[PDB]
Design a binder for this molecule. Structure first.
Ligand code: HEM
Ligand code: HEM
Ligand code: HEM
Ligand code: HEM
Lengths: 146, 138, 138, 146
């Protein structure tokens, strides 16, 4: 992960102002609204018929929180996303059957949502650095697919 | 495919972009170059430094074509005909760079329309740049 | 779009494929599973092993869907209308996987038809395939 | 580049049978025919208007031999593609402005062509290895763009 000493810095400082409960909720939420087919993996969450319904659903929110929570473990081991996310990789492949291609969709929605809560501060440079993180991650989750 | 409700949210979001289209276009272009350095290969005859004439003007060029598209939401292919022959025969750009440009527009719109960028608007806006992209790669 | 000469080449190559389409259907399907493990995620229920009796049967169904597409080259979107809902409602397979399979029919198709897979027929076929993929993705 | 010993074997083996003078011509040639736009890159090759002109063009055959030489030269260093291709990556970026995305295509056109020369011998598993090797070479060439 060719992250540079400045980039790493840009990311972290920002990450430490992130309201985990909101961002995670919102991101998983906009994945279900924006890329509807993804709804197929959570058919077991409840009402996911409408925007308001997906945003408003408590399992989405909670799950959201766990997902962002894991995204967070990764930022604390940038020099080794592979190993952190190995178990979830296999998990996501052997039990859940998720085309790793959707991992990027979640990465981008997330960038989209961070841009959303921070307006200016999500200056282009900062954005680039998170594009990489989101990128290493998605790759780290696809790594144990077989 | 654009459903009426999408056309509606699009027609709206964009009308809030208003007289700032160009300013957002250029932000968006500046983000794409910084976030995905490869897209730079198509603009080797451009200065790509922070806040420079070409990007700022080419930015006007791009937002202005989206405006024309929003306007002609319901007939997109005809209205974009010229723009397509240019991105398919002359420049000939890989469809992929289009996903990147569109992501960035979204980040940008999402960046200055905090209230407007709702999960449904986020939605339709993505299906739109997706249709604008398809007609420029056909 | 498919040109008259393109059509013609598609038909003379598949004509040669002949009765070995399911064979070819399957060989491809296999190359796909081995060269690009992610594509397996859509067949979690299949026995994916070398020789698999499910892989062969599927393969057929595929080859046969293509033959059907050939015989209806001028009207592929409707000729495949059903496999279209299938691959974009029930299943919802991402378009990139479509390029992978495509890249394998070509390869399987290439090791078995030395004499016919000329530059022209490869150019043609690649485009037919892109076409069949575009219908199943829209 | 996770190349198992077996793959590494299956690869090298086969490649000892390739006639790089002959196969590289074919590839770059096919590239120019199946992917038409990829001519915007050799207007110095003269006529390239029909398949026959492309395939038979001397400049094409010469150029492809070059390309294929660099490939062969990457197969003699499977464990260090990033370095082996560093200078040639920069070149394709700074001087030739080639969008990396076009490396995958040539890489694939090749895989097709190997299958065309060897037939039954170009068995699926050998292919899996080859796909791994072109994927890497495409990334190696792509890894110095900025
Ligand atoms: C980096 C991107 C992603 C990360 C970090 C992530 C993370 C997680 C985590 C931590 C869990 C809980 C693991 C456990 O409880 O054992 C999980 C479960 C799950 N994930 Fe992912 N995920 C990602 C993307 C996706 C996407 C794209 C899909 C499908 C669209 C998906 C589908 C699922 C499903 C269906 C579950 C099971 C929820 C349940 O327990 O009912 N994930 N994911
Ligand atoms: C929504 C997507 C896009 C739209 C609406 C769009 C629109 C335009 C427009 C209106 C022009 C100016 C045409 C003229 O000069 O009259 C243009 C030029 C150009 N665009 Fe696109 N574009 C899009 C995406 C892309 C992206 C993805 C690329 C490459 C990554 C790209 C590369 C170029 C290039 C290289 C030129 C020529 C610029 C010059 O030399 O001044 N465009 N585009
Ligand atoms: C030209 C490309 C393709 C063609 C022509 C094709 C054709 C078909 C056909 C005929 C069926 C069977 C429908 C039936 O049994 O009534 C099918 C089913 C299916 N296809 Fe495709 N397919 C293509 C590509 C793909 C690819 C790229 C994927 C995923 C990577 C895929 C995944 C599936 C799956 C999971 C099923 C259902 C399997 C089952 O449960 O029976 N197909 N396809
Ligand atoms: C594995 C993929 C590739 C490899 C190993 C490769 C290798 C090479 C080599 C060895 C040369 C001569 C280098 C030099 O002159 O310093 C070269 C030149 C060149 N390459 Fe690539 N290449 C690859 C793919 C591509 C493709 C996809 C393009 C664009 C279609 C491309 C475009 C060019 C161009 C335009 C030249 C200059 C030719 C001239 O004007 O003399 N290469 N490449």
């Amino acid at each position: 992960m060719h992250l540079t000493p400045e980039e790493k810095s840009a990311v972290t400082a920002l990450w430490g102002k992130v309201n985990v409960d909101e961002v995670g909720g919102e991101a998983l939420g906009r994945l279900l609204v924006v890329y509807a087919w993804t709804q197929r993996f959570f058919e077991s969450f409840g009402d996911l018929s409408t925007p308001d319904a997906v945003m408003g659903n408590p399992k989405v929110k909670a799950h959201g929180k766990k997902v962002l929570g894991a995204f967070s473990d990764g930022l604390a081991h940038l020099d080794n996303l592979k190993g952190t996310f190995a178990t979830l990789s296999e998990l996501h492949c052997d039990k859940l059957h998720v085309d790793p291609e959707n991992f990027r969709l979640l990465g981008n929605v997330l960038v989209c949502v961070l841009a959303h809560h921070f307006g200016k501060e999500f200056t282009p440079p900062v954005q680039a650095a998170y594009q990489k993180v989101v990128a290493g991650v998605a790759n780290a989750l696809a790594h144990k697919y077989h | 495919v654009l459903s009426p409700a999408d056309k509606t949210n699009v027609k709206a979001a964009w009308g809030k972009v208003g007289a700032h289209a160009g300013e957002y276009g250029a932000e968006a272009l500046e983000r794409m170059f910084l976030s995905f350095p490869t897209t730079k290969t198509y603009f080797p005859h451009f200065d790509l430094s922070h806040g420079s004439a070409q990007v700022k003007g080419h930015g006007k060029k791009v937002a202005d074509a989206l405006t024309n598209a929003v306007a002609h939401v319901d007939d997109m292919p005809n209205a974009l005909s010229a723009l397509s022959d240019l991105h398919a025969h002359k420049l000939r750009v890989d469809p992929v760079n289009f996903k990147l440009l569109s992501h960035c527009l979204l980040v940008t719109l999402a960046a200055h329309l905090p209230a407007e960028f709702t999960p449904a608007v986020h939605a339709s806006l993505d299906k739109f740049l997706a249709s604008v992209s398809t007609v420029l790669t056909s």
